[PDB]
Design a protein around this ligand. Structure first.
Ligand SMILES: Cc1cc2nc3c(=O)[nH]c(=O)nc-3n(C[C@H](O)[C@H](O)[C@H](O)COP(=O)(O)O)c2cc1C
Ligand SMILES: Cc1cc2nc3c(=O)[nH]c(=O)nc-3n(C[C@H](O)[C@H](O)[C@H](O)COP(=O)(O)O)c2cc1C
Lengths: 104, 108
């Protein structure tokens, strides 16, 4: 099943909701991640250029997909097939971001 | 501020998360709505044709926007400028639905 992360729009996009698959994939429980920016999933071999593309897309509220190296709670690396998009109201204000880690 | 509702994709879309603005707009605390289908926001003056369009769009996982009459927990009506979209993974599987609620009542 595909993981899902919901964040606030501002103040460094703290995580406000994760689905069950997020915990299966990453080994983190919700209480270990709520209120944190999702960048804690990154580690030593994460590609800096990929991180910079995510940073620019979120700053501009642009949809983006990246295959990014992340790390489980136990330190094991995994490929995250990540897609992020903004959630907007009908006046175009960004209410939240949603990220998905696609299962295969 | 606009409310946000996240639901499960399947089996009548129970609410799994609401933001703070949802509680400001609707008068419901998260405790009072988690595990429920959002249709409890509707009431006797809600337009049935609008509800039918929402039902068919959600069943098809098609994005939809409607202005719909909804009701706060204590029964006060409000007009909801509602936008619902599926959250899809890259294979096209629906992971969740997200709804954004804006109170557009012309109240005070
Ligand atoms: C909704 C959402 C979900 C995210 N999920 C992930 C993720 O699963 N893995 C990851 O490495 N980064 C994820 N990010 C990206 C980081 O939070 C951060 O935006 C990125 O590392 C770039 O910013 P930085 O250079 O400030 O770290 C997510 C961001 C958002 C808004
Ligand atoms: C994510 C999401 C958010 C929703 N938010 C609202 C809402 O704010 N107000 C509302 O009247 N219906 C809302 N609905 C629609 C109802 O849950 C339901 O789909 C609609 O009433 C049509 O189905 P029914 O005829 O079976 O009730 C939402 C649905 C989803 C999936």
């Amino acid at each position: 099943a595909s993981g899902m992360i919901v964040t606030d729009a501002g103040a460094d996009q703290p995580i406000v909701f994760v689905n069950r698959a997020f915990s299966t994939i990453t080994g983190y429980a919700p209480n270990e991640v709520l209120g944190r920016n999702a960048r804690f999933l990154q580690g030593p071999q994460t590609d800096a250029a990929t991180v910079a593309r995510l940073r620019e897309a979120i700053a501009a509220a642009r949809p983006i997909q990246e295959r990014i190296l992340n790390y489980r709670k136990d330190g094991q690396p995994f490929w995250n097939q990540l897609s992020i998009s903004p959630v907007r109201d009908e006046t175009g204000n960004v209410v939240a971001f949603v990220g998905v880690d696609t299962d295969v």
